[PDB]
Structures are given as structure tokens and as C-alpha cells.
């Protein structure tokens, strides 16, 4: 069956720049190509059909180009709402086939995280587990470091993290680290802190609480 190849599966670009996502068929598909945009929530819109043709709604900074085995979608002016994975599809032959996706990041000016720490609920201590949560909010770029200290003793291999998709209004991330202790362990210690390193912080930031 006709393979659709998008060799570059992750591309990042500046608000403003022209961007070009690329699609290659194994053989000629006669401009029988469509381009799909998939937002982080998972919703899938249809941008361009028959190579060059814009589905109503789509702004005219989207352009379809190409022929034969080679097709491009280009976004001329780049804006935050354009954060998505873009896919190509051919209807030249059955089965219908899709490119493996190009995930597009937006590059914007550095912005440090706001940091919040949240202690476990009393309702949680009943479980026998405690969960301390640290929140890094609206930062760019995505690269960030989070260290858990307990009573000023650095923790290891007892934390899990999670990071949002980039926001489609201000092009930032947010991040959620979760330290997990036993009730026993959580109530052997007074101080709980997360310390954050990020490009936009001239020096690290520690947020703490003091149990009891």
C-alpha cells in the first residue's frame, strides 16, 4: 500500500516565521493529498484538500503545495494557535494512508515558572500514602529541573513528573512534580521543599512548607 512519509516528526519555529511541513508518498498520488491538523486535546480538523485547497475557516496563512510524490504544507505567518500535529493523507488508492505526523513547537521569549508547593490533604493520610505536589506554571522553554528536598536532604527516585502540551494562547508550558511518601515517612519530617532551575531564573527558586 502507498506509504506516506513525513521524515521530520518534530519541528519548532518562532512566532512570525514561515514553516514548512513535508510529506512524501512511495509513488505518485496525483495531487490526491489532504492535510490534517490535530490539536493537543486530540481533536482533528481538516485544513487542506486536493493538495492546494483550503477548507473554509482555515486562514490564508496556510498554503498547500506540490505534486507527484512530494507535498508540503506551509504556514507563512506563525501564531500560537498553530500548535498541533499536522498529518498528510492520500485518497489516491485504497487503503487510505496517513503520514506519521509532524509535531510543531512555537519558539517564544524566555519566561520563568511561577512555583507553588501543595502539602498532602489529611484525607490522604488515611490512605497510608502522602503526596506532596510542586507546580511550575507558564514557563518557556520546556527544559526545567525540579529537586525535592526533605529536611534539607535531597530526594531521589521517589518523584514523578508530568508536563502539559504548550498553551495555544501564550506558547508556554506548565509542569507537575509529585513526591510520594508513606504516611510514616511524611510524618517523620518537618520541611518539604521543591527547588526549580530554569533558564529564566538567574538563581534557583525554592518553595517550602513546614509540617505541623
Amino acid at each position: 500500500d502507498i506509504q506516506m512519509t513525513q521524515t521530520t516528526s518534530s519541528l519548532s519555529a518562532s512566532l512570525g516565521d514561515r514553516v514548512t511541513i513535508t510529506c512524501s508518498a512511495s509513488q505518485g498520488i496525483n495531487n490526491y493529498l489532504n492535510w490534517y491538523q490535530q490539536k493537543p486535546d486530540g481533536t482533528v480538523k481538516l485544513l487542506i484538500y486536493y493538495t492546494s485547497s483550503l477548507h473554509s475557516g482555515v486562514p490564508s496563512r496556510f498554503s498547500g503545495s506540490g505534486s507527484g510524490t512530494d507535498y508540503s504544507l506551509t504556514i507563512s505567518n506563525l501564531e500560537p494557535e498553530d500548535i498541533a500535529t499536522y498529518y498528510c493523507q492520500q485518497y489516491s488508492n485504497l487503503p487510505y494512508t496517513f503520514g506519521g505526523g509532524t509535531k510543531l513547537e512555537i519558539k517564544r521569549t524566555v519566561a520563568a515558572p511561577s512555583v507553588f508547593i501543595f502539602p498532602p490533604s489529611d484525607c490522604q493520610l488515611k490512605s497510608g500514602t502522602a503526596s506532596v505536589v510542586c507546580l511550575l506554571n507558564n514557563f518557556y522553554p520546556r527544559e526545567a529541573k525540579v529537586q525535592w528536598k526533605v529536611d534539607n536532604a535531597l530526594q531521589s527516585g521517589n518523584s514523578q513528573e508530568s508536563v502539559t502540551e504548550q498553551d495555544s494562547k501564550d506558547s508556554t508550558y506548565s509542569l507537575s512534580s509529585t513526591l510520594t511518601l508513606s504516611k510514616a515517612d511524611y510524618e517523620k519530617h518537618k520541611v518539604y521543599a521543591c527547588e526549580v532551575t530554569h533558564q529564566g531564573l538567574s538563581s534557583p527558586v525554592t518553595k517550602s512548607f513546614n509540617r505541623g
Binding site: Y32, N34, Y36, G42, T43, V44, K45, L46, Y49, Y50, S53, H55, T85, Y87, Q89, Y91, L94, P95, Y96, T97, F98, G100, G101, S114, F116, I117, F118, P119, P120, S121, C123, Q124, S127, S131, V133, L135, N137, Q160, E161, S162, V163, T164, S174, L175, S176, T178, F209, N210
Partner: protein, 217 residues
């Protein structure tokens, strides 16, 4: 106008069978062709098949000739698609789509239906508040943990609050149960903050007020 509303998530037995629903509105149903698409967690998109509602005829991708089986009730404006003998390879999101002809393309997508396949039985989540201790920016959230399988919805004030919210991707734990965080930032009358968790695979709905203790002696 035009919508395709899909059956809620599914946990499924490794060996079972499942009929997904796609309830259509805003067009005359039989005047458009319905295709189904698979998306595995790597986020590749495969075409599964197509059905003509007017008629009932079909054209399956041969990848799924054994697995999937599509049908329509003209009346209820609703197509379906049944996976047979599910393995773990069936664990995916499943969109239903409409074909427009200008030529061809898929101009309206469902939101999708997450299917999971596992022996592991359902477990709905515990929901705990996240509230700080001590700027015109304070944060609350609530912590949705130890649930299975993967899909939970999280809302604030029944949909009222969208600005400030970040619901984080889940993390699988050593337990084999997932766990999620949802947080809101706010300006600093005392509006309440209520997080509405819906875990459909266990029929677990929870509304947890997150109490900010401002008062002092």
C-alpha cells in the same frame, strides 16, 4: 450544526468484543459516507474502513478485515463499529469521520473513543484537594489518583472556569494505576473552587470543593 458524538471510553477484556457508537446530526446522514480511523498511543493514524449509510455497503482496510465490523441505523442517525477478539493492539482512540466531496476528504471528525484492553479490573479514583499554606496569583488544584483505565475528565465550576486551568497528563505508577493533577491560578467576593472529576469507566463522578482558609483568630 454538524456533529459526531461518540460512545464514551471502554475498558475491555483481552478476548472480548465492543461496539462503538457514532451519533450524527446536522446533515441528512445517508448523503455522506462514514469512515473510521484508529490512533495508537504512538499517534499514528490508520484508516479502518468505510460505510455508505443509504445502502449499508462497506469497504474495510484489510488490516482490520477480521477485527472491525461497521453498521448503521438510518433512523437514529448513528453508525457503529465492532472490534472482535481484542488483543492489547486494539488499545487505541477511535475516531468516526464523514467524507465530503468537493474531491474527497474527511471534513468532520468525532472527538474519539479510547479503548483499553486488559484483564485488570476497573478502579475509579480518589480525589484530594490541593491547597497551599501561607501575590495576586494564588494556585489551587486537586489530585486525581489511583484510577484505571486512562480517561478522566476534569472540570472547574461545572465548566464555568477555563482561564488559569492546567490538567496534567496522567502518570502510570508502579501500582499499575494512573494519577493526575489539575490546578488553577486565580487573581486573589470569595468565589469557591470546585473540581468536577468524571471517570466514566467506573461511573465515578466527584465534585470536590477546594477550601482556601483565609480567616485568622
Amino acid at each position: 450544526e454538524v456533529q459526531l458524538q461518540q460512545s464514551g471510553p471502554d475498558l475491555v477484556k483481552p478476548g472480548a468484543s465492543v461496539k462503538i457508537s457514532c451519533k450524527t446530526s446536522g446533515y441528512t446522514f445517508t448523503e455522506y459516507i462514514m469512515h473510521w480511523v484508529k490512533q495508537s498511543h504512538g499517534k499514528s493514524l490508520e484508516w479502518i474502513g468505510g460505510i455508505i449509510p443509504n445502502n449499508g455497503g462497506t469497504s474495510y482496510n484489510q488490516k482490520f478485515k477480521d477485527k472491525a465490523t461497521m453498521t448503521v441505523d438510518k433512523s437514529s442517525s448513528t453508525g457503529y463499529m465492532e472490534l472482535r477478539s481484542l488483543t492489547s493492539e486494539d488499545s487505541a482512540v477511535y475516531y468516526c469521520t464523514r467524507r465530503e466531496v468537493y474531491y474527497y476528504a474527511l471534513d468532520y471528525w468525532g472527538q474519539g473513543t479510547l479503548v483499553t484492553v486488559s484483564s485488570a479490573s476497573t478502579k475509579g479514583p480518589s480525589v484530594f484537594p490541593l491547597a497551599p499554606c501561607s501575590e495576586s496569583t494564588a494556585a489551587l488544584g486537586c489530585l486525581v489518583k489511583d484510577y484505571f483505565p486512562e480517561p478522566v475528565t476534569v472540570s472547574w465550576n461545572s465548566g464555568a472556569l477555563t482561564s488559569g486551568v492546567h490538567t496534567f497528563p496522567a502518570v502510570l505508577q508502579s501500582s499499575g494505576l494512573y494519577s493526575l493533577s489539575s490546578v488553577v491560578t486565580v487573581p486573589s467576593g470569595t468565589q469557591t473552587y470546585t473540581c468536577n472529576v468524571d471517570h466514566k469507566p467506573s461511573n465515578t463522578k466527584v465534585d470536590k470543593c477546594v477550601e482556601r482558609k483565609s480567616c485568622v483568630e
